[PDB]
Structures are given as C-alpha cells and as structure tokens.
Design a protein around this ligand. Sequence first.
Ligand code: DTJ
Length: 264
Amino acid sequence: WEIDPKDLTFLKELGTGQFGVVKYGKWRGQYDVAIKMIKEGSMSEDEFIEEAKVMMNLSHEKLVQLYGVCTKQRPIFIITEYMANGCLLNYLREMRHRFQTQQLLEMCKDVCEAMEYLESKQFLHRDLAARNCLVNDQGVVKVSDFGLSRYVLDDEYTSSVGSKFPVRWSPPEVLMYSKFSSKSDIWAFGVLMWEIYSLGKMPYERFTNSETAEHIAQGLRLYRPHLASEKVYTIMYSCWHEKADERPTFKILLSNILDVMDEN
Ligand SMILES: Cn1nc(-c2cccc(NC(=O)c3ccc(C(C)(C)C)cc3)c2CO)cc(Nc2ccc(C(=O)N3CCOCC3)cn2)c1=O
C-alpha cells in the first residue's frame, strides 16, 4: 500500500544495502520504521511495483513486515518494520559468548516459522542468510527482504559467478541451472542454522565462491559446529541433500525443531 511520505520522519542513518541508503525514522510520530531510498538504477522498479501487493500481504510475526511504499516520487521508498538489534550475523558475533544452546535453537525456530509461512504462500525468499535476518529488542529473530533479490539490477549480484551472489547459501541446482524453488530456500536455511550454531562464522571460510561451488557439487558439506548437538546437526544436514526432492519442507523442519525442544 502507498504510504504518504508526509507521515514519515527521517531520524538516523542505518547504512547502505543492495538498493542504497536506508534510514531509521518514524511513521506518524509513533511507529519505528526503516525506510529504504531506492538508488536509481539499482532496482527493476516496474517489476517490483507491479508485483508488490502480494509482498505487502505477507503477514507473520517472524517476518520483517513490509508496511508499504512511496512511488509518486523518486527515489521510491520501501518502508519496513524496525529491528533495534540489527542483522543476525552481527548480533551472533557481538553476543557470541552469551548464548545458551536453547537460545540458538529458538532463533532457528523463529526463522523456520517465518519460512513455513512463506512456503505455505508459495513465496520464495531467494537470499535467506543470517545477514538477511534481523533481531528486535527482545532477541526475536525475523526474516527480512524476502523476494527482493528478484528485482536487483547489479550483474555482480544476479550472476552466479558475480562477487555478490550468495554462492555459500545456494544448492547445486541453483549454482548450475538457476533453479530456485522452495527447496533452494531449504538449503539456505540449513546454512543459516550453521551460521547460528557457529556463532556467526563465515561458511566455507578461506574458500572462494567457485571453490565452494565445486566442493559442494562433489558432496562436501559444512562441519558440525561445536555447539550443535547430533540431533540439531541432523536437521541442518537434511537441508543439504544433493537432490532437491530429498530435502524436507519447512513444516517438517519446524516439527523436527519442536521435537528437539520437547526432548531437552
Ligand atoms: C529494517 N531494518 N533494515 C536495516 C538495513 C539497513 C541498511 C541496509 C539494509 N539492507 C537492505 O536494505 C537490503 C538487504 C538485502 C537485499 C537483497 C536484495 C535481498 C540482497 C536488498 C536490500 C537493511 C536491512 O533491510 C537495518 C535495521 N536495523 C538496524 C538496527 C540497528 C543497527 C545498528 O547500527 N546497530 C549497532 C548498535 O547496536 C546493534 C545494532 C543497524 N540496523 C532494520 O531494522
């Protein structure tokens, strides 16, 4: 839905992302929001504006909500839910020594719930990773920027040999054929579980992107992080079946994670 830009108050810079500058502010003085100012030439704006209603209607506690847009002016604005603790990857690394294993599992559950919801709506994230999860003031993890990778205009991001392509979160059928599906979000979720349980380590560190693609194509997988139990690793490992149809759904994954919680 179209937000009235007069209802927005810009308060602080939040840095830069794939679409340029993002600011912290408020909507009608009360609601904290992030406001993306879409760098001209960085986004396929027709495609995005054409297909944006569906994305505004995705509503779930564990999604970083898309409140609406401003399109009557340039640059266009995307206004989203504000998350005080920022992105999950930096949160993991900064709070690395505080987490108890049950909290790690709870973060995975947060994301899995969001992804079960997207799955049920046949909506793909396409770039699930700890950097594209955000954390609010109570430590709840939410999935952010789902589906926007489809509108990126940047050859370094959209080409699987580009320097910005999420190679380390991609299954073989994406790296070889660009076959995105629910099962490629599944693969990425397993890697995200690995990010959480490794407390923010980089997957395949010291491997290049091409070396990563080569070595996952040959069946090699991320090691079990120290803080992951056998059961937890079995869950993240099931996301990495070479053949996409052997990977679980997010409904099954959620059940697996709940089962682990019951047992503890
Ligand atoms: C919604 N939102 N968005 C951002 C934020 C800010 C800048 C850039 C971005 N990223 C993006 O816009 C973005 C991300 C991914 C994509 C693709 C297409 C999927 C690849 C496209 C655009 C984002 C995420 O959308 C930061 C938030 N929040 C914070 C909060 C605090 C801090 C922070 O500085 N700290 C330091 C002090 O304490 C910890 C938090 C940073 N970001 C926030 O709530």
